[PDB]
Structure 1
Amino acid sequence: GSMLVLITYDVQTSSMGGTKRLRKVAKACQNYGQRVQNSVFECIVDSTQLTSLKLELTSLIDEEKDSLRIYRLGNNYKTKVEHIGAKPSIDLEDPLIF
């Protein structure tokens, strides 16, 4: 469907293995998406990639210790997105002339 989704995490690093969980979660979530803010990623995925990422990521985090939220906008994401500061991000609809 090629729809834009956004993922936020919040892992407790004061536990026994918080640092390793943070590292694995960040590494796994960076593969499927592009970082826009600290602990806030956005990506363009279908239903299949979204389901695969959700299944992969629900096994790395530990319940009753972490938080993870996933939002989806839709095919019209170009309207419901606003940037005001000085942290630009690459748009995956650009011809990408590097």
Structure 2
Amino acid sequence: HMMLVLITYDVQTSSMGGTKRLRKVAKACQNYGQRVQNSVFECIVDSTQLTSLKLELTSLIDEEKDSLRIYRLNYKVEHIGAKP
């Protein structure tokens, strides 16, 4: 019952506050997984971990300016361009 979960975080980093929110979101997601691009994370989590992480993420983002999408994927992925 472990799941691959993809988290995509849309935040304006032109501001120092949006910069800090990304750093906080990255730190939260990296407890459960990997930062694969600047604001994209791949976490392998069970249901309890996903509930905990979603709750934490909800407290970290600006729900009026940012958005976060969570994709639930026993799971193909291609990478083109620079390695991060």
Unaligned runs of 5+ in 1: 88-98
Percent identity, aligned pairs only, is: 100
Compute the displacement of 1:84 (Å). 6.1
Distance 2:65 2:82 in 1: 33
Question: Secondary structure of the residue that 1:59 maps to in structure 2?
Answer: helix
Question: Secondary structure of the residue that 2:20 maps to in structure 1?
Answer: helix
Please give the TM-score of this superposition, normalised by the length of structure 1. 0.69
CA contact (8 A) 2:29 2:43 kept: no
- How many residue pairs get aligned? The number is 81
Compute the displacement of 1:37 (Å). 2.2
Question: Secondary structure of the residue that 2:16 maps to in structure 1?
Answer: coil
Distance 1:60 1:82 in 2: 29
Higher percent of residues as strand: 2
CA contact (8 A) 2:26 2:35 kept: no
Unaligned runs of 5+ in 2: none
Compute the displacement of 1:83 (Å). 5.1
